[PDB]
């Protein structure tokens, strides 16, 4: 689940909202290379491994 | 942000109505049959009394 530790605000309400959901359409709300030209978007952490 | 409380309130309200509707339909259907059998038995008692 949450690999970086913290609190998920209103998790059970999200479960209740997602109970009556048929389909989802995943889209890109903010492009990573375009919308942040003055900040570094390359951020990784060792608390969430992926392929060693 | 209180969807769970709303669903619990609809569960209570829709669960009492089914019980009371069943109770009403069942009571009317047993008392109708009891009434008709009571009338038939009364006619039989009159015939037995005149016979005796």
In chain A, the N- to C-terminal Cα span, in Å, equals 18
- Compute the distance between CA of residue A36 and CA of residue A30 in angstroms, rounded to an integer: 9
Resolution (A): 3.0
Locate A24 and state its tokens. 């989802």
Neighbours of B7 (CB within 10 A): 13
Locate B11 and state its tokens. 């569960």
Entry field: residues in chain A: 52
- Say yes or no for a CB contact (<8 Å) between A17 and B3: yes
- Compute the distance between CA of residue B22 and CA of residue A18 in angstroms, rounded to an integer: 33
Using an 8 Å CB-CB cutoff, list residues of chain A that contact chain B: 10, 12-13, 16-17
Q: Annotate B1-52 with DSSP letters as a single string.
A: --HHHHHHHHHHHHHHHHHHHHHHHHHHHHHHHHHHHHHHHHHHHHHHHHH-
Note the Cα A43 to chain centre separation in Å: 14
Alpha-carbon distances of B17 from B13, B14, B31, rounded to whole Å: 7, 5, 21
CB contact set of A10 (below 8 Å; sequence gap of 6+): B1
Nearest chain A Cα distance for residue B2, angstroms: 7
Q: What angle do CA B38, B25, B15 make, to 5 degrees?
A: 150
């Amino acid at each position: 689940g949450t690999c970086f530790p913290g609190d998920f605000a209103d998790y059970e309400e999200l479960r209740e909202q997602l109970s009556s959901v048929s389909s989802f359409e995943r889209f890109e709300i903010f492009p990573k290379e375009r919308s942040w030209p003055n900040h570094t978007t390359r951020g990784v952490t060792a608390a969430c491994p992926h392929a060693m | 942000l209180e969807k769970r409380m709303e669903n619990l309130n609809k569960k209570v309200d829709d669960g009492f109505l089914d019980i009371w509707t069943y109770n009403a339909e069942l009571l009317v259907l047993l008392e109708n049959e009891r009434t008709l059998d009571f009338h038939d038995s009364n006619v039989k008692n009159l015939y037995e009394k005149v016979k005796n």
